[PDB]
Amino acid sequence: PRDAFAAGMAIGGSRVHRMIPYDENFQILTLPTTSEGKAKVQVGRGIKINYIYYWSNSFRDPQIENTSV
DNA sequence: AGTAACGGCAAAGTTATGGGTAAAGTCACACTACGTCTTTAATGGGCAGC
């Protein structure tokens, strides 16, 4: 397959218009979610995803606290 | 005799209900409740009269 792939890129070119860098934004664009897709924000704890709690400063707001996001 | 409407057969679908696992959600660990005042009735001493 490797030489066939090289021949394919030789005949068909490279098509640089389709080139996408491996930047962090793409990585964010390739992130799956959980089945429910929402997690509730506990006081101090954060959001429980896959048995693991995650925290951000934005959770300290009273209006978001104790809610599902 | 051909065609559209009606109805039976049946499978396909729809909620519903009692099970299973897996994961989000709760909450107690943070020294700590048992404690005190009030109530009537019976009884048991000393104290006094016979």
Q: Which nucleotides of B are covered by protein (CB under 7 A)?
A: 23-27
A65: how many CB neighbours lie within 10 A of its CB? 13
Q: How was this structure determined?
A: cryo-EM
C-alpha span between A39 and A58 (Å, rounded): 15
Between CA A35 and C1' B12 the distance (Å) reads 29
Nearest nt to A50, CA vs C1'? Answer: B23
Type of residue at A65: E
Q: Which of residues 35-54 of A touch strand B (CB under 7 A)?
A: 36, 38-40, 42, 45, 47-51
